[PDB]
């Protein structure tokens, strides 16, 4: 239920050894607008794979 001993600074860091975040392995570039975006996502200006399928 609860600990009989304070775990150390070291055990705490060992637990967190898998807590690092992975970065975006690569951004993709639009063939038409050159914007960087998440792959298979639309751009922030509304482009996906060179086509402007949003109003904005």
Partner 1 sequence: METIAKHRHARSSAQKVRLVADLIRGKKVSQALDILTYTNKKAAVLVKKVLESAIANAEHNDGADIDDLKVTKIFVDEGPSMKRIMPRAKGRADRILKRTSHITVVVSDR
Partner 2 sequence: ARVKRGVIARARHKKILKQAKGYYGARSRVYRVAFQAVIKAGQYAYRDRRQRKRQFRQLWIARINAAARQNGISYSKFINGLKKASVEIDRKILADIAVFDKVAFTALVEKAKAALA
Partner RNA sequence: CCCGGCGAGGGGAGUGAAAAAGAACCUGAAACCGUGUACGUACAAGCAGUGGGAGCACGCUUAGGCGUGUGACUGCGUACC
Partner RNA sequence: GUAACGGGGCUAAACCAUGCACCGAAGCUGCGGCAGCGACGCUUAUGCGUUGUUGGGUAGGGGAGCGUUCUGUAAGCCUGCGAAGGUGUGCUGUGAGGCAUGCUGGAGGUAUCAGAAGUGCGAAUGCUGACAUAAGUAACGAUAAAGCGGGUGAAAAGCCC
> Applying CB under 8 A, which residues contact partner 1?
19-21, 23-24, 27, 36, 38
Which of 4, 9, 20, 50 binds RNA (CB under 7 A)? It is 9
Cα–Cα distance, 18 to 16 (Å, whole number):
5
Burial class for 19, CB neighbours closer than 10 Å (0-12, 13-18, 19+): exposed
- Near RNA in 13-32, by CB under 7 A: 13, 15-16, 19
Q: Is the dihedral of CA 18, 23, 26, 29 positive or negative?
A: positive
Q: Does 9 bind partner 2 (CB under 8 A)?
A: yes
Q: Under the rule (CB under 7 A), what is the footprint of RNA?
A: 2-3, 6-7, 9, 11-13, 15-16, 19
């Amino acid at each position: 239920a609860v600990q009989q001993n304070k775990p150390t600074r070291s055990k705490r860091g060992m637990r967190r050894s898998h807590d690092a975040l992975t970065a975006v392995t690569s951004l993709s570039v639009d063939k038409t607008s050159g914007e960087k975006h998440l792959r298979h996502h639309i751009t922030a200006d509304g482009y996906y794979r060179g086509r402007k399928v949003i109003a904005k």
